[PDB]
Amino acid sequence: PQITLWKRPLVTIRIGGQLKEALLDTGADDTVIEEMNLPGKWKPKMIGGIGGFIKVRQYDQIPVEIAGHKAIGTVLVGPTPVNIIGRNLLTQIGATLNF
Amino acid sequence: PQITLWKRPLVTIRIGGQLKEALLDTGADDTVIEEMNLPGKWKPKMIGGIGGFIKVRQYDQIPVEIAGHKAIGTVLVGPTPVNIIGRNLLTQIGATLNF
Ligand SMILES: CC(C)CCN(C[C@@H](O)[C@@H]1Cc2ccc(cc2)OCCCCCC(=O)N[C@@H](C(C)C)C(=O)N1)S(=O)(=O)c1ccc(N)cc1
């Protein structure tokens, strides 16, 4: 689909059998989801943003369905203000910026 | 043009007569520019992101050329690690996300 930017680009995703709302963020290298229970092992990691660094749990090879499109990749879980779909998964669904 | 997301979507912008590289960021509500001595009146503001909040100076109606496309709107100036073009200016150049 073609999404305009007058409103935040929020979309429903399905992760771990659960539905959630997430922001398609071209300015994010990675995908960071609010604290939740995800199956499998996770490694501790730190990611940075505008205000500094936060500690997150890194899950590898997790299936994520974004607006009906499938992706499988790394998902970081931690204290983020909003669920974020970053470039690692946006590239898998073939998302591009157009103007 | 069509910009893929394999790499950070950085482009050249023109602001205050200067050329800078900035990130096309669909996850940023407003545009945030690295510290620069822009003339004009401003209002203090706090914006929060992953690691927390930072204090910025809000300037209104600042002309910004993005990849040869003219836009004009609010620009926040503060200690950001990178120049960020947000939805407030992206909507002006007709930018969309497509997949
Ligand atoms: C939705 C919310 C959690 C985040 C909104 N933000 C935009 C988001 O795209 C920001 C933009 C940004 C900030 C710093 C940076 C690189 C990009 O370099 C440092 C080095 C860190 C780069 C790694 C990275 O991509 N970090 C992402 C994170 C969400 C995975 C990130 O914070 N992306 S923001 O904090 O930069 C921001 C907030 C408010 C306004 N108005 C503008 C920008």
Partners of A67 on chain B (C-beta within 8 Å) are 99
User: Is A29 an active-site residue?
Assistant: no
Closest residue to A95, CB basis, from B23, B80, B97: B97
Out of B8, B23, B25, give the residue to mutate to test ligand 1, the one with the largest number of ligand atoms within 8 Å of its CB: B25
Contact between residue A60 and residue B55 where contact means Cβ atoms under 8 Å apart: no
What was the elucidation method? X-ray
3-state secondary structure A33-93: ECCCCCCCCCEEEEEECCCCEEEEEEEEEEEEEECCEEEEEEEEECCCCCCEECHHHHCCC
Residues 6+ apart with CB under 8 A from A56: A32, A44, A45, A46, A47, A76, A77, A78
Please list the residues that pair with B70 across neighbouring strands: B65
- Pick from B61, B70, B59: which is nearest to B14 by CA? B70
Write the single-letter amino acid at A82: V
Is the domain covering A1-99 a CATH 3.40.50.720 domain? no
Q: Give the angle subtended at the CA of B69 by the CAs of B40 and B75, to the nearest 5°.
A: 30
User: Cα distance from B48 to chain A (closest Cα, Å)?
Assistant: 7
Encoded tokens for A47 = 């990611």
